[PDB]
């Protein structure tokens, strides 16, 4: 019986769960911050 | 105006300034932003129901000369 590992080296990263959570948190935070800043800039422009 | 932070002792201490300056504009964006996001702190706090005190009658004088002079 054979065990093929087609994992792409994913096992070598330490704390893969926490690192993936950090990546998702960074992307989500950047997206939400940019969206909020854009909305507030738009509202400031419209009121001005 | 000043921007202050609420310390753990419920004391507001200045930590910044709001300083908005603009030429021709249709409104003040600072007030709109604060109204939309924050909450308004009203010093006056209404009671659950009004408490009537009294209904009083006052007769206005015929002549306004003494009040005008005083």
Curated annotation (Swiss-Prot), chain A:
For this protein, the parts annotated as crossing the membrane are none
Spell out which residues are annotated as carrying Phosphoserine: 38
Give the superkingdom in one word. Eukaryota
PTM comment for this protein?
Answer: 4'-phosphopantetheine is transferred from CoA to a specific serine of the Acyl carrier domain by the C-terminal PPT domain. This modification is essential for activity because fatty acids are bound in thioester linkage to the sulfhydryl of the prosthetic group.
Entry similarity comment = Belongs to the thiolase-like superfamily. Fungal fatty acid synthetase subunit alpha family.
What job does this protein perform? Fatty acid synthetase catalyzes the formation of long-chain fatty acids from acetyl-CoA, malonyl-CoA and NADPH. The alpha subunit contains domains for: acyl carrier protein, 3-oxoacyl-[acyl-carrier-protein] reductase, and 3-oxoacyl-[acyl-carrier-protein] synthase. This subunit coordinates the binding of the six beta subunits to the enzyme complex.
Q: How does it assemble?
A: [Alpha(6)beta(6)] hexamers of two multifunctional subunits (alpha and beta).
Other remarks on record? Answer: Present with 17000 molecules/cell in log phase SD medium.
User: What name does the UniProt record give this protein?
Assistant: Fatty acid synthase subunit alpha
Protein species of origin: Saccharomyces cerevisiae (strain ATCC 204508 / S288c) (Baker's yeast)
What is the gene called?
A: FAS2
Complete protein: which residues are present? 921 to 968 of 1887
Swiss-Prot record, chain B:
Superkingdom, taxonomy of origin: Eukaryota
Q: What is this protein called?
A: Fatty acid synthase subunit beta
More info: Present with 91800 molecules/cell in log phase SD medium.
State how it assembles: [Alpha(6)beta(6)] hexamers of two multifunctional subunits (alpha and beta).
Q: Which gene does this sequence derive from?
A: FAS1
User: What does this gene product do?
Assistant: Fatty acid synthetase catalyzes the formation of long-chain fatty acids from acetyl-CoA, malonyl-CoA and NADPH. The beta subunit contains domains for: [acyl-carrier-protein] acetyltransferase and malonyltransferase, S-acyl fatty acid synthase thioesterase, enoyl-[acyl-carrier-protein] reductase, and 3-hydroxypalmitoyl-[acyl-carrier-protein] dehydratase.
Q: Which family, according to the similarity comment?
A: Belongs to the fungal fatty acid synthetase subunit beta family.
Organism, by scientific name, is: Saccharomyces cerevisiae (strain ATCC 204508 / S288c) (Baker's yeast)
């Amino acid at each position: 019986p054979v065990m093929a590992d087609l994992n792409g080296g994913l096992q070598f990263v330490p704390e893969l769960k926490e690192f993936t959570a950090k990546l998702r948190k960074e992307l989500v935070e950047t997206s939400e911050v940019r969206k909020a800043v854009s909305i507030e800039t738009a509202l400031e422009h419209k009121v001005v | 105006g000043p921007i202050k932070v609420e310390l753990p002792t419920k004391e507001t201490v200045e930590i910044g300034i709001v300083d908005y300056e603009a030429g021709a504009s249709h409104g003040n964006p600072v007030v709109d932003f604060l109204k939309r996001n924050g909450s308004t702190l009203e010093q006056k706090v209404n009671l659950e129901n009004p408490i009537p005190i009294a209904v009083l009658d006052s007769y206005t004088p015929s002549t306004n000369e003494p009040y005008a002079r005083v």
